[PDB]
Paper text:
In a screen for effectors that alter [name] dynamics, we identified a *Legionella* effector, [name], which colocalizes with the [name] cytoskeleton in eukaryotic cells. [name] specifically binds F-[name] through a novel [name]-binding domain (ABD). Furthermore, we demonstrated that [name] exhibits lysine fatty-acyltransferase (KFAT) activity, targeting host small GTPases. The head of the hammer is formed by a globular domain (NC-domain), which is contributed by both the N-terminal (residue 1-137, red) and the C-terminal lobes (residues 356-469 pink) of the protein, while the handle of the hammer is formed by an elongated, anti-parallel, coiled-coil hairpin (CC-domain), which contains the middle portion of the protein (residues 138-355, cyan).
The CryoEM density map of the complex allowed a complete resolution of the [name] subunit in the F-[name] filament, including its bound ADP and Mg^2+^ ion ([Fig fig2], [Fig figs3] and B). The cryo-EM structure also revealed the distal portion of the coiled-coil hairpin, which consists of about 1/3 of the entire [name] ABD domain ([Fig figs3]). The structure revealed that the two α-helices of the [name] ABD domain are zipped together by a stretch of hydrophobic residues, mostly leusines and isoleucines ([Fig fig2]). The ABD domain radiates away from the central F-[name] core with its tip of the hairpin region binding to the site between two adjacent [name] molecules within each strand of the F-[name] filament ([Fig fig2]). The ABD domain embeds a surface area of 3703 Å^2^ on the [name] filament, which is contributed by both the D-loop region of the n^th^ and the hydrophobic cleft of the n+2^nd^ [name] monomers ([Fig figs4]). Several hydrophobic residues (Y240, L241, and L244) located at the tip of the ABD hairpin are accommodated by a hydrophobic pocket formed between the two adjacent [name] molecules ([Fig fig2]). The hydroxyl group of Y240 of the ABD domain forms a hydrogen bond with the main chain carbonyl group of V47 at the D-loop; the amino group of D248 of the ABD pairs with the carbonyl oxygen of G48; and the side chain carbonyl oxygen of ABD Q254 makes hydrogen bond with the main chain amine group of S352 of [name]. Moreover, salt bridges are also observed between R236 of the ABD domain and D27 and E336 of the n+2^nd^ [name] monomer ([Fig fig2]). In the [name] ABD and F-[name] complex, specific hydrogen bonds are formed between the backbone carbonyl group of D-loop residues V47 and G48 and the ABD residues Y240 and D248 ([Fig fig2]). These hydrogen bonding interactions cause the D-loop to insert slightly deeper into the hydrophobic cleft and induce a unique conformation of the D-loop residues G50 and Q51 (*[name]* numbering, equivalent to G48 and Q49 in *G. gallus*) not observed in other structures ([Fig fig4]).
Residue numbers in the entry:
A (entry chain L): 212 to 280
B (entry chain B), C (entry chain A): 7 to 376
Write the structure that this text describes.
Amino acid sequence: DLKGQLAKLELHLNKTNGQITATERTINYLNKLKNPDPKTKTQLIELTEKLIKLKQEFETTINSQHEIS
Amino acid sequence: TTALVCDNGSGLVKAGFAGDDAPRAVFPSIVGRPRHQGVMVGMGQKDSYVGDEAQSKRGILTLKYPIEHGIITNWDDMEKIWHHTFYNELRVAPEEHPTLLTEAPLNPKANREKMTQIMFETFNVPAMYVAIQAVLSLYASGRTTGIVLDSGDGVTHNVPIYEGYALPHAIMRLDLAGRDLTDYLMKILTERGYSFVTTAEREIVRDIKEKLCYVALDFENEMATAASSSSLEKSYELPDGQVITIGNERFRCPETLFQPSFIGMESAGIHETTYNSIMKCDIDIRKDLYANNVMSGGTTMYPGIADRMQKEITALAPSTMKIKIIAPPERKYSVWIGGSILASLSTFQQMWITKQEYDEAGPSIVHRKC
Amino acid sequence: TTALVCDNGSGLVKAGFAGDDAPRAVFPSIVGRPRHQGVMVGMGQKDSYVGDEAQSKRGILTLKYPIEHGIITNWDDMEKIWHHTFYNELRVAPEEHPTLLTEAPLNPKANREKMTQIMFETFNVPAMYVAIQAVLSLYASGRTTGIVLDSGDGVTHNVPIYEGYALPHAIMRLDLAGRDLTDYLMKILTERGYSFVTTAEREIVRDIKEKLCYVALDFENEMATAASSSSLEKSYELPDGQVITIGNERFRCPETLFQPSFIGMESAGIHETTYNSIMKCDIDIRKDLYANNVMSGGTTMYPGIADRMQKEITALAPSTMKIKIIAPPERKYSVWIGGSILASLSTFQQMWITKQEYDEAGPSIVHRKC
Ligand SMILES: Nc1ncnc2c1ncn2[C@@H]1O[C@H](COP(=O)(O)OP(=O)(O)O)[C@@H](O)[C@H]1O
Ligand SMILES: Nc1ncnc2c1ncn2[C@@H]1O[C@H](COP(=O)(O)OP(=O)(O)O)[C@@H](O)[C@H]1O
Ligand SMILES: [Mg+2]
Ligand SMILES: [Mg+2]
C-alpha cells in the first residue's frame, strides 16, 4: 500500500507542476501588455491567485511525500 | 470545457488540450499501405495503417505523406489522420469541444475552405478557428515586438510584427526545409558507398540526420580541418547490425540552409531573407526588430545554428545596432505552446466561428479575417 | 599518336583507337577459374582463364564478374582484364599512348582514385582521363540539348543537358538492368519445367534473352492474345540438341523495365523516372528536353521499346507538347563512339591529367573536375 500511495502522490505532484508551468506562461504573456482589455485585467488577477494556490498545494504534496519517506 | 489545440504539421502531428505545457500526443503524419500478398489465414485484413503503427512496420509498407510543402495533396489520407488523432490517440469525442488549427502564411485559399468543410460537415465540432503559425510563436516567446523565423518541415517563413501590428508586405516564404536536407543527405551519403533508395531507408536517413549533424561556425575552415585530420568522424549503427562512418557530411547537410545553391535552387540563404524582411519595413522600427529575433520549428535544433545566425546577421547589418537571437530551449513545440495560450485567453473566447455562422454566411466566413 | 578509348563496362569490354567507327576489340568482362582436378600430364596448369577463351570453355569453369552495378568489387580480376585488353587483345604497349575511361555518374569516389592509381603506378600510361558515360552519348547523337537515357548492363541513369550546361540536381540513377532481366527469365522459365541453375546455364539464358524477346505495345491485351491463341510461341535449340518452346515469357522479361514490382523493387518504371527528371529542371527548358530524348546502351535494343516509350511519355506529359525518341541504330556502341570523337577534338587535347600532375597534386586531382 505504501508503494502505491507514494506513486499516486508522485503522479499528483507531476500534474501540479504541469499546471504551474502553463499558468506561469500565461501570466508571463499577460504581464507585457500595457493597455489590457477589461476582461484581461480580471483574468490576470485570477491567474495570479491560482498560481499561488497551486504553489502551496505543491508544497503540501511534496511535504507529505517526504513524510512518507 | 477544454478546447483541443491540434497542429497539423508537414512532418509531425501534435494534438493536445488547452492549458497544458506539452501536446498530449505526438506522432508522424504518414499513411502506410501494404505491398505484398499476405499468405496467413485469420490475420484480419487492414487496408492501410496510419500513425505510429505504420512507422513500426515500415518493412512491408509503402509510406506516403498526405501533406507536402504545407499544402495538402491527398484528402482521404488527411481525413484518416484526423480521425485517428481524435478517436484512437486522444480518446475524446470531437462533438463536445471546439478546435484550433494552424496554417502557414501565403497558402492557397481553397485549403482553408476545404479544411473548414471537413471539420464541420464530417466531424461536427461546435466551433473551429485557424491561425497563422508564425504569430502563435510570439505568445510562447513572451514578447510583442519581433520577427519570428518559424522553420518547420516542408517550408520556412518570416513574419515581422511590431506592437501587435503584423506587417503583411514584409512576410516572406520559402520552400527549403527538413525534407530537402534528408534528400541531400541521401545524395551525398551515396559517395562513400552507402546507397539508400526506398522510403523506409529514407526514414533511417532522417534518423541519421537527427542524431549526427551540426552547423559549423565557418565553412571553408571546417572543410580544411576535416580533410587534414580525421577527428570529425562518427559511427552510427543501422537496424541490420551494420556500422556507417560519417565524416564531412555531418555539416554539409544543414549548410544547405545558408547556401541554397547546393540543391540547384536560386534564392538566397535564410540570413539574407531575414535581413531583407527587416529592411522591407519602415525606418523607425528596424532597431527593435534587430534587437528581438525569434526561432521556432524543429529544423532550428541543429547545434550551433544560433551562433552562425548571429554572426551572419551582424556581418550583414550596420554597426551600432545590437543583434540577439532569442532561441529558447524546447523551441520544437513553441508554435503549439502558443495555441494553448491563445485558447486560454478570455478575450479570444469570443472570436470562434460557431457552426451556425458557417451554415448561414457560407465558406467565405473564414477568409474575412484572413 | 593515337589515344586508346577503352570503355570498361558492367557486362562487356570494348577497346579501340581514336578516329575509328567501331571498337577494335569487344569481349566479355569475366574471369573463369577451373573447378576439377586435371588428370593429364603436359597440359601445363593455367590458374584462371580471362576474356573470350573462358566463355569458350565454360563447361568446367566457375565464371565470375569483377564488376557489378557499375561499382568494381574485385580488383585483381579487373587488373587481369585490363592487362589482357592492353597486351593480348589490342597488341599495343600502353606506355606510348594516353587513355580515356568512362564511369557512370553518382559512383563512389574511391573507385576513381583506385582506378587512377592502377592506371599510373602499374601500367605507366603518360596521361589518362575519365568521363561520364551519359555525356559521351550526346557527341555521338550530334546535338547539344537533350536528356540521355543510357541503359547499360548493371545500372541505368538519366542526365539532362541544355546548351552544354549539365544540370547536376536532375540526374537520376537506378539499379535495374540486363542482369536482373536474366535472373527473372530464369525464374519464370522455371514454370514450364526448364531449370537453369549454374553460371554457364545463366549464360545460355542470356543468349535466349538476346535472341527471343520483344516489348509489347500494351500488356494486358498481349497477355490475353497469347493465352487465347498459340501464335506467340518460339522454338530455340540448346547446345545439347534439346528444344525449348517459349510462350508468354517472350514479353514478360523486358516488361520488368516498366513495372519494377515484378522483382520486388519499389521504384517506378523508367518512363516515370524520365518524366520526373524532365520536370525537375527549370520551367523554360522543359520543351526542348521533351522534343529531344536519347537512348543508349545495349539494354535498349528490344524490338518495340521506342514506341512504348513514346506512348507512355505522351500519355504522362501534357498535350500541345511534341515528343520524339531519338533512337538511332547501332546505339549499342553509342557511348564508345562518343569517346573517340571526344579524343579527336583539338581543344580536348589540353585537358588530360599528365603523370607529373598526379605525382605532384596527389589523388585528389581527378575529383577537381568531378
Ligand atoms: N533535434 C533535431 N535536430 C535536427 N533536426 C530536427 C530535430 N528535430 C526535428 N528535426 C527535423 O525537423 C523535422 C520535423 O519538423 P516539425 O517540428 O514537425 O515541423 P512542423 O511542426 O511544422 O511539422 C524533422 O523532419 C527533422 O528532420
Ligand atoms: N540485341 C539485344 N537485345 C536485347 N538485349 C541485349 C542486346 N544486346 C545486348 N543486350 C543486353 O545488354 C547487356 C550488355 O549491355 P552493354 O551494351 O554491355 O552495356 P555496357 O556497355 O554498359 O556494359 C547484355 O547483358 C544483354 O543482356
Ligand atoms: Mg512546425
Ligand atoms: Mg554501356
